[PDB]
Design a protein around this nucleic acid. Structure first.
Ligand SMILES: Nc1nc2c(ncn2[C@@H]2O[C@@H]3COP(=O)(O)O[C@H]4[C@@H](O)[C@H](n5cnc6c(=O)[nH]c(N)nc65)O[C@@H]4COP(=O)(O)O[C@H]3[C@H]2O)c(=O)[nH]1
Ligand SMILES: [Mg+2]
Ligand SMILES: [Mg+2]
Length: 87
RNA sequence: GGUCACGCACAGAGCAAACCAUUCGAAAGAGUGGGACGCAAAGCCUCCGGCCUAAACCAUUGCACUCCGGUAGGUAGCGGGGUUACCGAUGG
């Protein structure tokens, strides 16, 4: 199951794009290093976030410590990603 | 002369990008005043394509690194099309 990139789900769609990036950046970067965050609010991409880490154990600790967290008054559904980012 | 096209002018007009001020707006963007980048319809209309915004209503639990919900607003100075018009190259 474990992977590098973090896939966040069930996020608040009312939140603007830029702020969501910044809100997730500040919250998560206490676990490890971050290269980029990808978020869009297209029909297919709503309530979703992608975090580009370097190591697994940071991302694992990011996942296992806050799964179900009421971020912006909504539970965070946190599970791993599948494909390596094209960067 | 009319009409339909056309723009190498002539002649009298017209409009106003950017920026600034101010109002409206959630925003894109619009109004107004100053100001001219340009414009042969840069007059007027969103019917079609594009592009831009997304606050609200409805829809949506979605795995991306092309871009993609409905709806609503916007752009006519992004094209298409509709509609109106000044001048007239011994002009076609
Ligand atoms: N009366 C009349 N004359 C015409 C017309 N078409 C062409 N001309 C003549 O041809 C010149 C160059 O035309 P342009 O390439 O459209 O280049 C023009 C045009 O792009 C622009 N312009 C000026 N006035 C207007 C206007 O009322 N509407 C538009 N759309 N553009 C204008 O400025 C340029 C220079 O303007 P001008 O000093 O008048 O110089 C004009 C004008 O003398 C027309 O339909 N009516
Ligand atoms: Mg003149
Ligand atoms: Mg003409």
């Amino acid at each position: 199951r474990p992977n590098h990139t973090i896939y966040i789900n069930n996020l608040n769609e009312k939140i603007k794009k830029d702020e969501l990036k910044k809100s997730l950046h500040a919250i998560f970067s206490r676990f490890g290093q971050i290269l980029d965050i990808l978020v869009s609010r297209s029909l297919k991409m709503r309530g979703q976030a992608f975090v580009i880490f370097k190591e697994v154990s940071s991302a694992t600790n990011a996942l296992r410590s806050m799964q179900g967290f009421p971020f912006y008054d909504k539970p965070m559904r946190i599970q791993y990603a599948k494909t390596d980012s094209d960067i």
